[PDB]
Structure formats: C-alpha cells, structure tokens
Design an enzyme around this catalytic site. Structure first.
Site, mmCIF file in Angstrom:
data_model
loop_
_atom_site.group_PDB
_atom_site.id
_atom_site.type_symbol
_atom_site.label_atom_id
_atom_site.label_comp_id
_atom_site.label_asym_id
_atom_site.label_seq_id
_atom_site.Cartn_x
_atom_site.Cartn_y
_atom_site.Cartn_z
ATOM 1 N N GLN A 1 0.812 -1.208 0.000
ATOM 2 C CA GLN A 1 0.000 0.000 0.000
ATOM 3 C C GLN A 1 0.845 1.258 0.000
ATOM 4 O O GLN A 1 2.010 1.250 0.360
ATOM 5 C CB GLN A 1 -0.920 0.065 1.226
ATOM 6 C CG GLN A 1 -0.095 -0.125 2.500
ATOM 7 C CD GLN A 1 -0.878 -0.106 3.779
ATOM 8 O OE1 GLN A 1 -0.547 0.803 4.547
ATOM 9 N NE2 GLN A 1 -1.704 -1.129 4.098
ATOM 10 N N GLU B 1 -4.205 3.290 -0.180
ATOM 11 C CA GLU B 1 -5.004 3.450 1.022
ATOM 12 C C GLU B 1 -5.322 4.933 1.211
ATOM 13 O O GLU B 1 -4.408 5.716 1.515
ATOM 14 C CB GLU B 1 -4.268 2.872 2.251
ATOM 15 C CG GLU B 1 -5.051 2.931 3.533
ATOM 16 C CD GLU B 1 -4.132 2.800 4.752
ATOM 17 O OE1 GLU B 1 -2.966 2.517 4.497
ATOM 18 O OE2 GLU B 1 -4.549 2.864 5.916
ATOM 19 N N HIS C 1 4.434 11.721 -5.838
ATOM 20 C CA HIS C 1 3.356 11.317 -6.753
ATOM 21 C C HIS C 1 3.131 9.818 -6.678
ATOM 22 O O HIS C 1 4.053 9.067 -6.375
ATOM 23 C CB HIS C 1 3.631 11.765 -8.180
ATOM 24 C CG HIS C 1 4.925 11.319 -8.822
ATOM 25 N ND1 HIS C 1 5.996 12.191 -8.908
ATOM 26 C CD2 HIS C 1 5.257 10.267 -9.569
ATOM 27 C CE1 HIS C 1 6.988 11.598 -9.627
ATOM 28 N NE2 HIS C 1 6.548 10.429 -10.031
ATOM 29 N N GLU D 1 1.208 10.657 -11.911
ATOM 30 C CA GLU D 1 1.937 10.537 -13.143
ATOM 31 C C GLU D 1 1.185 9.599 -14.086
ATOM 32 O O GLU D 1 0.696 8.557 -13.642
ATOM 33 C CB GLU D 1 3.309 9.945 -12.864
ATOM 34 C CG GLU D 1 4.146 9.956 -14.142
ATOM 35 C CD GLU D 1 5.554 9.420 -13.961
ATOM 36 O OE1 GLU D 1 6.093 9.890 -12.951
ATOM 37 O OE2 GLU D 1 6.078 8.570 -14.774
HETATM 38 C C1 LIG Z 1 -3.002 3.769 7.849
HETATM 39 O O1 LIG Z 1 -2.718 2.355 7.837
HETATM 40 C C2 LIG Z 1 -3.411 1.454 8.624
HETATM 41 C C3 LIG Z 1 -4.028 1.743 9.900
HETATM 42 C C4 LIG Z 1 -3.932 3.007 10.656
HETATM 43 C C5 LIG Z 1 -4.408 4.256 10.483
HETATM 44 C C6 LIG Z 1 -4.265 5.357 11.486
HETATM 45 O O2 LIG Z 1 -3.964 5.077 12.681
HETATM 46 C C7 LIG Z 1 -4.334 6.834 11.118
HETATM 47 C C8 LIG Z 1 -5.297 7.732 11.605
HETATM 48 C C9 LIG Z 1 -5.286 9.088 11.285
HETATM 49 C C10 LIG Z 1 -4.273 9.614 10.476
HETATM 50 O O3 LIG Z 1 -4.175 10.953 10.105
HETATM 51 C C11 LIG Z 1 -3.292 8.744 10.006
HETATM 52 C C12 LIG Z 1 -3.319 7.393 10.336
HETATM 53 C C13 LIG Z 1 -4.663 0.663 10.530
HETATM 54 C C14 LIG Z 1 -4.761 -0.585 9.946
HETATM 55 C C15 LIG Z 1 -4.195 -0.836 8.694
HETATM 56 O O4 LIG Z 1 -4.225 -2.031 8.035
HETATM 57 C C16 LIG Z 1 -3.474 0.146 8.026
HETATM 58 O O5 LIG Z 1 -2.924 -0.183 6.789
HETATM 59 C C1 LIG Z 2 7.886 11.658 -12.337
HETATM 60 O O1 LIG Z 2 8.845 10.673 -11.955
HETATM 61 C C2 LIG Z 2 9.371 10.391 -13.192
HETATM 62 C C3 LIG Z 2 10.119 11.383 -13.874
HETATM 63 C C4 LIG Z 2 10.248 12.770 -13.418
HETATM 64 C C5 LIG Z 2 10.033 13.558 -12.348
HETATM 65 C C6 LIG Z 2 10.052 13.309 -10.877
HETATM 66 O O2 LIG Z 2 10.286 12.196 -10.305
HETATM 67 C C7 LIG Z 2 9.890 14.521 -9.993
HETATM 68 C C8 LIG Z 2 11.019 15.013 -9.326
HETATM 69 C C9 LIG Z 2 10.945 16.123 -8.502
HETATM 70 C C10 LIG Z 2 9.725 16.772 -8.302
HETATM 71 O O3 LIG Z 2 9.678 17.885 -7.481
HETATM 72 C C11 LIG Z 2 8.586 16.306 -8.968
HETATM 73 C C12 LIG Z 2 8.671 15.192 -9.795
HETATM 74 C C13 LIG Z 2 10.577 11.046 -15.152
HETATM 75 C C14 LIG Z 2 10.409 9.800 -15.712
HETATM 76 C C15 LIG Z 2 9.735 8.817 -14.989
HETATM 77 O O4 LIG Z 2 9.511 7.540 -15.411
HETATM 78 C C16 LIG Z 2 9.205 9.113 -13.737
HETATM 79 O O5 LIG Z 2 8.553 8.131 -13.037
HETATM 80 ZN ZN LIG Z 3 7.533 9.146 -11.389
HETATM 81 ZN ZN LIG Z 4 -1.638 1.671 6.107
#
Ligand SMILES: COc1c(/C=C/C(=O)c2ccc(O)cc2)ccc(O)c1O
Ligand SMILES: COc1c(/C=C\C(=O)c2ccc(O)cc2)ccc(O)c1O
Ligand SMILES: [Zn+2]
Ligand SMILES: [Zn+2]
Lengths: 176, 176
Positions: free
Chosen positions: A26, A92, A119, A165
């Site tokens: 994820q 997620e 991204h 992207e």
């Molecule tokens: C976020 O990932 C998870 C979570 C957990 C999520 C959080 O605790 C959470 C709450 C608010 C916030 O701003 C950021 C994170 C719980 C179970 C699970 O499988 C998982 O993948």
């Molecule tokens: C976007 O990531 C790419 C890039 C090109 C750009 C970036 O990764 C990127 C770098 C800095 C920033 O501030 C924002 C974007 C070029 C080819 C490619 O396959 C790819 O995945």
């Molecule tokens: Zn990229």
């Molecule tokens: Zn998570």
C-alpha cells in the site's frame, strides 16, 4: 552530480531469504472528502474499492483501492480483509472525519515546501488517448503530455491535489 | 461520522474499458542520500534495484526499486526500461543532486503538519520476526509491534524518516 550506475549498484545488497515473501502492498494518502476521492479513483482512473474500515474511536475510515476485478473480492468479512491487505499496489485513502466540512482545511501534496512524497504513477497503454479522456472528464492537469521538455509523459491531480503521473512504459525509451 | 458502507459504494463507478489495462506502477519519494536509501531498501527490506535514470541538465536521478527477481531484469537497456516501468508496485526514489551535502536540507514524511502522504506498507508473513531482525540491524521504529493499541502492526522509518508499515494481512482480521 549523482552516483554512477556501478556505484549505485555497489550500494545494493542481495535480498535476505527472510524477506523473500515481502510485497509492496500500500501507499497511504489522507483525503479531505472521500466521496470525491472515490469518484475520481474509480470513475476517472478505473480502480476498484476492495475494502473499507471504520474506526469510530479514532474518527477515521480507511478505503483500499486497487486494479482488481471486483468479482474476485471475497464475500465473507474476515476473508475479505485478508485478501485486500495481501494485494500488491493498493492505494489506502484515510478519511479523518469532519475534514470535508471544514473550509479552512486541506492536505499538502509534497511538491512544495516542505517536500517529500511526490506522486503515484499509473502505467497506461497510451498517454495521449488517456489524457484526451481525462480532458473530456474535466480533470485538473499539472503537466499535459506535450507541455514541457518531457513530451509523452503527463501529470494530473486528484481532488486533494495529489499528483498522479501518467506514463506509457513502451514509449519511455527515448527519455533517460 | 464518516460514510456508511452503502454511501461509499454509491460513490464508486465500474471501470471504464478505457482503463482496463491501467496499473499502479509507482510511488515516488524524494531521498536526501541515495547511498543510504539503496542500502536500506535492498539490504534491510529485500527489494531489488531494477532501473536507474540520470538527468544531468536537471541535476537529478531516479531509482526504481521493486520486489522482483533480479534474474527477470531484461539484459538489454531499452527492454529493461519497458519491463521495469510496467512492473506493479515499484518504489521510485528521486535524488536531487547535492542534498546529501546540505546540512540545512531534509525531506518531510507527511505525518506532522502539514500532513498528506502517510506511508508505504509492506505485507510480511511474520511481523514480529521481521521487526526482531530490523532491530538487530539498527532500524529506527515509529511503532514496535507490541507498542500502543494496534498490537501486531509495526511502523519503521527509512533513512529520510518516511514511515513504512509492516503488516501481516492474515492477522489483520484476528488482531481485532
Ligand atoms: C493507515 O494504515 C493502517 C491503519 C492506521 C491508520 C491510522 O492510525 C491513522 C489515523 C489518522 C491519520 O491521520 C493517520 C493514520 C490501521 C490498519 C491498517 O491495516 C493500516 O494499513
Ligand atoms: C515523475 O517521476 C518520473 C520522472 C520525473 C520527475 C520526478 O520524479 C519529480 C522530481 C521532482 C519533483 O519535485 C517532482 C517530480 C521522469 C520519468 C519517470 O519515469 C518518472 O517516473
Ligand atoms: Zn515518477
Ligand atoms: Zn496503512
């Protein structure tokens, strides 16, 4: 100015056998308004909602989106969670309850101070056909396919303004 | 109070045939020092470096990491770009040249204001064994498996401080 190929590869160890079943499952993004975000990821990008989790104490919900055939989702709850959390390449989306009603609130997309995440990226068969359709749909662009020096690559934005992207892997050998 | 199940599904559209072959190909994170990053993601987490691109006028590099067998990497440079950028679930690390010799620069992990991105996650067979090994190897933890409320789930930190969830899909129903 950066590592050479050889130097980078020098920095790479072989995988310990203990990790041999690890998978990158994820990427978690906080979303303001899950209605808008669900609509974009499913209708615009053709992902499927494979699982939803709600946590009333912590006042948030989790929405797992994937490129998965909805007909493959298990019916039974426990089975369903185990299946969705073992799929590769899920998105997620975390909804902190009450953000969609708060005009002063927005999330940060990582692409301006303070920077970090950049991204997610969708591989498509054809960047220009995909982008014409995104245009007909009213999608916000950061960078159109023919905009800029990197022709044939695009960036759109989701309802929170996260960047996405749009790349075609079979054209991309005219770039490096 | 967050969305009902019904209301969530009601904001879901079926996938338009224009998206039928789309895949979630990458998450991009910016990295201060690729040498530490590559060591971590390969030696600690068991990923493979599958592709490296360098952009000498814009002064950055891209590193593509993935859970793939290094014997599946094409031998030929252009086929390799097409194979690597058509793999699901890649981590894309961007190194802007110079950051690694700038004591005043650091990337933000999205978990303190201003928040957005939260983490990537790795599904593993065994959260406790994985995290015993992480501890042995000096890895920094946000959350040990047994810490806090959500037992049997961990979060580690990479060299830039990005959070990485460590979960076992098949305990995530049980661990109620
Ligand atoms: C976020 O990932 C998870 C979570 C957990 C999520 C959080 O605790 C959470 C709450 C608010 C916030 O701003 C950021 C994170 C719980 C179970 C699970 O499988 C998982 O993948
Ligand atoms: C976007 O990531 C790419 C890039 C090109 C750009 C970036 O990764 C990127 C770098 C800095 C920033 O501030 C924002 C974007 C070029 C080819 C490619 O396959 C790819 O995945
Ligand atoms: Zn990229
Ligand atoms: Zn998570």
């Amino acid at each position: 100015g950066g590592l050479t190929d050889e130097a980078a590869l020098s920095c790479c160890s072989d995988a310990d056998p203990s990790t041999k079943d690890f998978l990158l499952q994820q990427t978690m993004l906080r979303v303001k308004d899950p209605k808008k975000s669900l609509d974009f990821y499913t209708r615009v990008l053709g992902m499927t909602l494979i699982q939803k989790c709600d946590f009333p104490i912590m006042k948030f919900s989790l929405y797992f989106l994937a490129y998965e055939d909805k007909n493959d989702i298990p019916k039974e709850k426990d089975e369903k969670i185990a299946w969705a959390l073992s799929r590769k390449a899920t998105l997620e989306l975390t909804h902190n309850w009450g953000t969609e009603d708060d005009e002063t609130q927005s999330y940060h997309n990582g692409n301006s101070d303070p920077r970090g995440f950049g991204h997610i990226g969708i591989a498509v068969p054809d960047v220009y056909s995909a982008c014409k359709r995104f245009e007909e749909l009213g999608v916000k662009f950061v960078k159109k396919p023919d905009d800029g020096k990197m022709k044939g690559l695009a960036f759109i934005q989701d309802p929170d303004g996260y960047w996405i992207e749009i790349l075609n892997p079979n054209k991309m050998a005219t770039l490096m």
